[PDB]
Design a protein around this motif. Sequence first.
Motif, PDB file in Angstrom:
ATOM      1  N   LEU A 197      65.537  88.896  47.964  1.00 50.67           N
ATOM      2  CA  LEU A 197      65.625  90.333  47.748  1.00 50.67           C
ATOM      3  C   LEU A 197      66.308  90.996  48.936  1.00 50.67           C
ATOM      4  N   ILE A 198      67.328  91.801  48.652  1.00 51.22           N
ATOM      5  CA  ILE A 198      68.011  92.601  49.659  1.00 51.22           C
ATOM      6  C   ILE A 198      68.056  94.042  49.172  1.00 51.22           C
ATOM      7  N   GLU A 199      67.863  94.981  50.091  1.00 51.01           N
ATOM      8  CA  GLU A 199      68.023  96.408  49.814  1.00 51.01           C
ATOM      9  C   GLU A 199      69.280  96.865  50.549  1.00 51.01           C
ATOM     10  N   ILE A 200      70.383  96.974  49.813  1.00 51.91           N
ATOM     11  CA  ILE A 200      71.684  97.285  50.394  1.00 51.91           C
ATOM     12  C   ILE A 200      71.900  98.790  50.292  1.00 51.91           C
ATOM     13  N   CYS A 201      71.830  99.479  51.430  1.00 54.29           N
ATOM     14  CA  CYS A 201      72.052 100.923  51.481  1.00 54.29           C
ATOM     15  C   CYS A 201      71.214 101.639  50.426  1.00 54.29           C
ATOM     16  N   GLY A 202      69.951 101.239  50.317  1.00 51.91           N
ATOM     17  CA  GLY A 202      69.060 101.809  49.330  1.00 51.91           C
ATOM     18  C   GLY A 202      69.217 101.260  47.933  1.00 51.91           C
ATOM     19  N   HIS A 203      69.944 100.158  47.764  1.00 49.46           N
ATOM     20  CA  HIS A 203      70.127  99.513  46.469  1.00 49.46           C
ATOM     21  C   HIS A 203      69.494  98.130  46.526  1.00 49.46           C
ATOM     22  N   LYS A 204      68.553  97.870  45.620  1.00 49.68           N
ATOM     23  CA  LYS A 204      67.842  96.598  45.580  1.00 49.68           C
ATOM     24  C   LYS A 204      68.629  95.575  44.768  1.00 49.68           C
ATOM     25  N   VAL A 205      68.751  94.360  45.307  1.00 45.93           N
ATOM     26  CA  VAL A 205      69.442  93.272  44.621  1.00 45.93           C
ATOM     27  C   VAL A 205      68.749  91.959  44.962  1.00 45.93           C
ATOM     28  N   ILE A 206      68.878  90.984  44.063  1.00 48.66           N
ATOM     29  CA  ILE A 206      68.296  89.657  44.240  1.00 48.66           C
ATOM     30  C   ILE A 206      69.388  88.626  43.989  1.00 48.66           C
ATOM     31  N   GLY A 207      69.629  87.767  44.970  1.00 51.28           N
ATOM     32  CA  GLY A 207      70.627  86.733  44.801  1.00 51.28           C
ATOM     33  C   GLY A 207      70.538  85.698  45.898  1.00 51.28           C
ATOM     34  N   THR A 208      71.525  84.806  45.905  1.00 50.08           N
ATOM     35  CA  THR A 208      71.575  83.752  46.907  1.00 50.08           C
ATOM     36  C   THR A 208      71.992  84.324  48.255  1.00 50.08           C
ATOM     37  N   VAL A 209      71.310  83.883  49.308  1.00 48.38           N
ATOM     38  CA  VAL A 209      71.585  84.324  50.670  1.00 48.38           C
ATOM     39  C   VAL A 209      71.652  83.093  51.560  1.00 48.38           C
ATOM     40  N   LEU A 210      72.784  82.905  52.229  1.00 52.67           N
ATOM     41  CA  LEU A 210      72.952  81.815  53.175  1.00 52.67           C
ATOM     42  C   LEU A 210      72.628  82.296  54.585  1.00 52.67           C
TER      43      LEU A 210
END
Lengths: 99, 99
Positions: A63-76
């Motif tokens: 889970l990442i919150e990008i500039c107030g936008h929540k997203v779920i994906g692969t993170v290296l």
Amino acid sequence: PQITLWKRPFVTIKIGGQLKEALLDTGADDTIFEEMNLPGRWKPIMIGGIGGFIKVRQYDQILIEICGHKVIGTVLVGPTPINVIGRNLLTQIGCTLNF
Amino acid sequence: PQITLWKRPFVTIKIGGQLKEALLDTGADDTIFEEMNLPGRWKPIMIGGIGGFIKVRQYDQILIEICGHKVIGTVLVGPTPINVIGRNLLTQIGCTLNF
Ligand SMILES: CC(C)CN(C[C@@H](O)[C@H](Cc1ccccc1)NC(=O)O[C@H]1CO[C@H]2OCC[C@H]21)S(=O)(=O)c1ccc(N)cc1
């Protein structure tokens, strides 16, 4: 927001309870972060770039919150000189290039 | 045009009379191309990225026609795995990120 490119397009992001800045990188297929404390299991992989290859730890369903936008994906996580948000997550916030 | 990021944002460009495809790379400060025939003087330099650095030939005031948009700026030529249009030229076509 609409972001011009006279400076490096950095944004504030929240990931694993930690605050970080990351570069909106349309040239990056995948998201990669410098070494950081993330929970759970991970798979070793290697990615390639302009200077060669680096070994990184692959985490899925992060889970990442990008500039107030929540997203779920692969993170290296690995020895990148800079945190980069790749296209795998840019699509999820509906990011587009315009000119 | 507006470009989504479900695919690599490649665009067709004309440079030095040659046709090439290049990646709209917001994570790239400067433009670099694979090995190619470019006229004039050049300065040796080294740029850095994921996995390290590469030695490239730096050419200044080089004309590029990016998707029908003419621009003049610095263009590096070297062992990049991919041609990338960097921010040094993206700014001149008025390119922006939007979400
Ligand atoms: C090899 C290209 C496809 C460039 N890529 C993204 C790009 O934005 C990198 C991202 C980047 C940014 C800073 C440092 C390392 C990598 N920039 C880069 O290497 O460009 C260089 C030319 O302009 C200079 O400006 C800095 C980098 C130089 S990449 O880093 O290698 C990459 C590749 C695969 C993934 N999953 C994620 C990222």
